[PDB]
């Protein structure tokens, strides 16, 4: 991995690019002929929002996702992983992947509401005051439709709207 | 054995008094305006019992204050026993004041009208003049029906009380009933004058309740008069502590005193 360091001395600035050792891929993938990382490690339709050990492999230290041209994923797997990362960040998983602000960490606010499988942004949803009757019912989306193809051991389809 | 006296704090609340509404008197200001003040006489105001903050509200302590003395022969056994343990004759009105823990006073302590000072705002709580079962026109100010253009037995009726589709009347409907005998509070009444000899407060404006009624008076709780407790005696007024008698009448900075040079404008 590459880092940029800045040095200031006597109104003179020097920026340097330092390369440190980075982890490499594990020696034995179960499906070596796959052209895609997830699809060759046999994790397709196998991860969820709570699999942080996989979701944190490729995200920036401040929580941002990594570009597809760098990660190597196929488009659908990239979208699924991006949605899973968003859901984990909203649920509260990955607590060390946030920027550090000492000035803003002191003014504590109201306690965070526990949540999980959150599809939309918490600040963009309006409360459903009407809620409809049985024939026209306003359903609350839960989870994401991108993960509707995950393996279901019980056989019951996931309730994405409830 | 007085309880320890604590220094005043920005978020402190004081105890109040239970006075008697004597009457109403005119008063004049040095600028020429004329106000009307109510006389509240502190006849015999005492602290009866103390209740801790956690045992009462969890935010403030409760001090119980008793007003004018009554007869022993018309009180219940429990009340008479309570006053016998306390050591004071029975009182007529008993009220509860929410104070801070630093303003607590030992029970049995007397309270005087010098507890308030000329130039201050107070809250006055009392039971208003009860007018009994009053009609809707006097209870709610409803306009009546016309007098003589043909109306038959409807000159003061409320009229329609609800809507046809609802098939009922809402719980907030204004209808004839009791009017007057309820507790009301007047906020932000100015104190103009304190008569120490007779223990009387001259409070600005009107006071709820009939004359010669027991009135619960305390410091104003409006946000505009939150921190005027600084200059006032914080725990209470102790006439035996200063060892110097207060003046018979304490006036405000704008009150035209009875002995005046008959103010003329320049």
């Amino acid at each position: 991995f590459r880092e940029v360091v800045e040095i200031l001395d006597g109104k003179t600035t020097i920026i340097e690019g330092r390369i440190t050792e980075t982890p490499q891929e594990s020696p034995n993938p179960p499906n070596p002929t796959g052209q895609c990382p997830i699809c060759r490690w046999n994790l397709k339709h196998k991860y969820n929002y709570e699999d942080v050990l996989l979701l944190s492999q490729f995200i920036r230290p401040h929580g941002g996702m990594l570009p597809r041209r760098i990660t190597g994923l196929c488009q659908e797997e990239h979208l699924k992983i991006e949605e899973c990362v968003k859901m984990a960040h909203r649920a509260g998983l990955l607590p060390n992947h946030r920027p550090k602000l000492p000035e803003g960490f002191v003014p504590k606010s109201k306690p965070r509401l526990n949540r999980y499988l959150t599809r939309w942004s918490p600040r963009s949803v309006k409360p459903i005051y009407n809620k409809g009757h049985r024939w026209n019912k306003v359903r609350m989306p839960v989870g994401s439709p991108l993960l509707k193809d995950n393996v279901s051991y019980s056989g019951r389809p996931l309730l994405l709207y409830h | 054995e007085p309880w320890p006296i604590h220094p005043w704090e920005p978020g402190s609340s004081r105890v109040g008094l239970i006075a008697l509404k004597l009457g109403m008197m005119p008063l004049w200001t040095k600028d020429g305006q004329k106000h009307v003040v109510t006389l509240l006489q502190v006849q015999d105001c005492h602290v009866l019992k103390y209740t801790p903050k956690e045992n009462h509200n969890g935010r403030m302590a409760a001090l119980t204050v008793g007003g004018k003395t009554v007869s022993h022969f018309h009180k219940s056994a429990s009340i008479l026993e309570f006053y016998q343990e306390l050591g004071l004759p029975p009182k007529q009105k008993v009220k509860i004041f929410n104070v801070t823990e630093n303003a607590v006073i030992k029970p049995g302590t007397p309270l005087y009208a010098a507890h308030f000072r000329p130039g201050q705002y107070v809250d006055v709580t009392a039971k208003t003049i009860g007018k009994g079962f009053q009609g809707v026109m006097r209870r709610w100010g409803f306009k009546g029906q016309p007098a003589t253009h043909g109306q038959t037995k409807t000159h003061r009726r409320p009229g329609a009380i609800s809507t046809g589709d609802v098939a009922r009347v809402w719980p907030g409907t204004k209808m004839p009933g009791q009017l007057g005998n309820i507790d009301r509070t007047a906020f932000g009444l100015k104190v103009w004058r304190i008569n120490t000899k007779h223990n009387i407060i001259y409070v600005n404006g009107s006071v709820p309740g009939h004359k010669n009624c027991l009135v619960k008076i305390k410091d104003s709780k409006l946000p505009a008069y939150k921190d005027f407790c600084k200059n006032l005696p914080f725990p209470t007024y102790f006439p035996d502590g200063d060892e110097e008698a207060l003046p018979e009448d304490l006036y405000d900075e704008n009150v035209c005193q009875p002995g005046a040079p008959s103010i003329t404008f320049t």
């Binding site: 939309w120 942004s121 600040r123 963009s124 949803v125 309006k126 | -």
Partner: protein, 38 residues
């Protein structure tokens, strides 16, 4: 801002951004091109 059901860019400087759950045509050169998806 004009509230519309269909958003279209009226120049080359209009950019489409998703905010508050809606889609927006924001424009800096021509502020009259501000459109909000209903």
């Amino acid at each position: 801002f004009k509230t519309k059901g269909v958003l279209k860019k009226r120049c080359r400087d209009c950019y489409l951004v998703k905010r508050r759950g809606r889609w927006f045509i924001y424009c800096k050169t021509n502020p009259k091109h501000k459109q909000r998806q209903m």
